[PDB]
């Protein structure tokens, strides 16, 4: 490990509080893609020129064209990438990738199979896995390892700020710091939790309270800290119980409550390390209305993550909105501070 004196930031766009993406460039000259920075995965992919326009997703996203890059290096190894919500398929390529100020040689997937559902609903083109080589499909070096290799980053850490949505155009949707934190976006002190293990951004969670009573994960459980999850997620059994406690009806893909009932819904806490991390109903309800007649989604849903990572809680954007999160690869731990 070699440390320099460079901090590098990635400005992020907040789509509807569910999609947080920033811009990278690939090739000479650069081709730009909107990408989700996903601690729950370890590959880079963007859609490919070689994707059939029979995938309507590829018609509606930026496509990497290797025939327009003078820094492309062929590989052509196939790979399938499996995500919580959908699956993509293609082949491996090498090129120069620009992220913040930093230029790195990176192996990445050219995706050629991009299902209409759900990629038609994606503001973003691709994904930059911020996880560990142990999770990388085709055991490819993840972009963060490659930047650390360059010995320019002041620290072997990266931090996430996820703003609330804003009408105002001049609002900052989010910020990734590579090699640091931005003290302009948190307050009080970081509180750290060491990982179950190296190779996954997962930590021991002691309890979930719904207002008064610890009626979930009573013994102890797993929390994946997943900058690529829109929501906080537990396992079908954890949730259909959580929601029964809240008084929430179960729709096909999410839980809802009558909008009128939303604001008085109880606090939800998360025992991580020392501190108890609490969310108000404001923090976990899409309060889009106050009418008893209309229905309001909650930012918590069922996610059955398969082993060996699963089953686990996923703490995504619902949680990171309140808690500025610092991923410390140096000491294998996650820092949390109160966001501002
Ligand atoms: C693809 O890259 C891998 C890993 O760096 C390399 O060892 C392999 O031989 C490459 N395959 C081709 C066909 O270029």
From Swiss-Prot:
Q: How is its activity regulated?
A: Interaction with ATP6AP2 results in a 5-fold increased efficiency in angiotensinogen processing.
Spell out the GO cellular component terms annotated for this protein, sorted alphabetically and separated by semicolons: apical part of cell; extracellular region; extracellular space; plasma membrane
Q: What is this protein called?
A: Renin
Does the keyword Protease feature in the UniProt annotation?
Answer: yes
Report the residue ranges that make up the Peptidase A1 domain in this protein.
20-337
Q: Which residues are glycosylated?
A: 5, 75
Indicate the family of this protein: Belongs to the peptidase A1 family.
Question: Could you tell me what this protein does?
Answer: Renin is a highly specific endopeptidase, whose only known function is to generate angiotensin I from angiotensinogen in the plasma, initiating a cascade of reactions that produce an elevation of blood pressure and increased sodium retention by the kidney.
Per the Swiss-Prot or TrEMBL record, the active site comprises 38, 226
* Gene name, Swiss-Prot/TrEMBL: REN
Is-annotated flag, keyword Hydrolase?
yes
Q: Which reaction does it catalyse?
A: Cleavage of Leu-|-Xaa bond in angiotensinogen to generate angiotensin I
Q: What is its EC number?
A: 3.4.23.15
Q: Origin, by domain of life?
A: Eukaryota
């Amino acid at each position: 490990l070699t440390l320099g004196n460079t901090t590098s930031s990635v400005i992020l766009t907040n789509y509807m509080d569910t999609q947080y993406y920033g811009e990278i460039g690939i090739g000479t000259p650069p081709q730009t893609f909107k990408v989700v920075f996903d601690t729950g995965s370890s590959n880079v992919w963007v859609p490919s020129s070689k994707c059939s326009r029979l995938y309507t997703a590829c018609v509606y996203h930026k496509l990497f064209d290797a025939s327009d890059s003078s820094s492309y290096k062929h590989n052509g190894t196939e790979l399938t990438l499996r995500y919580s919500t959908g699956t993509v398929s293609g082949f491996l390529s090498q090129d120069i990738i620009t992220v913040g100020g930093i230029t790195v040689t990176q192996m990445f997937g050219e995706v050629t199979e991009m299902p209409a559902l759900p990629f038609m609903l994606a503001e973003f083109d691709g994904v930059v896995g911020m996880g560990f080589i142990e999770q990388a499909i085709g055991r490819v070096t993840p972009i963060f390892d490659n930047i650390i290799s360059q010995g320019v980053l002041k620290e072997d850490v990266f931090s996430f700020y996820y703003n609330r949505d804003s009408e105002n155009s001049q609002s900052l949707g989010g910020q990734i710091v590579l090699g640091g934190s931005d003290p302009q976006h948190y307050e009080g002190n970081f509180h750290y939790i060491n990982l179950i293990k190296t190779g996954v951004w997962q930590i021991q969670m002691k309890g979930v309270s719904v207002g008064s009573s610890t009626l979930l994960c009573e013994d102890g459980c797993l929390a994946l800290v997943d900058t690529g999850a829109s929501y906080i997620s537990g396992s079908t059994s954890s949730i259909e119980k959580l929601m029964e406690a809240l008084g929430a009806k179960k729709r096909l893909f999410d839980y809802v409550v009558k909008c009128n009932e939303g604001p008085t819904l109880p606090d939800i806490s998360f025992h991580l390390g020392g501190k108890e991390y609490t969310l108000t109903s404001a923090d976990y309800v899409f309060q889009e209305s106050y009418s008893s007649k209309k229905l309001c989604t909650l930012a918590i849903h069922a996610m059955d993550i398969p082993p060996p990572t699963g089953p686990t809680w996923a703490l995504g954007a619902t949680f990171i909105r309140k808690f500025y999160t610092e991923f410390d690869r140096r000491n294998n731990r996650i820092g949390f501070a109160l966001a501002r």
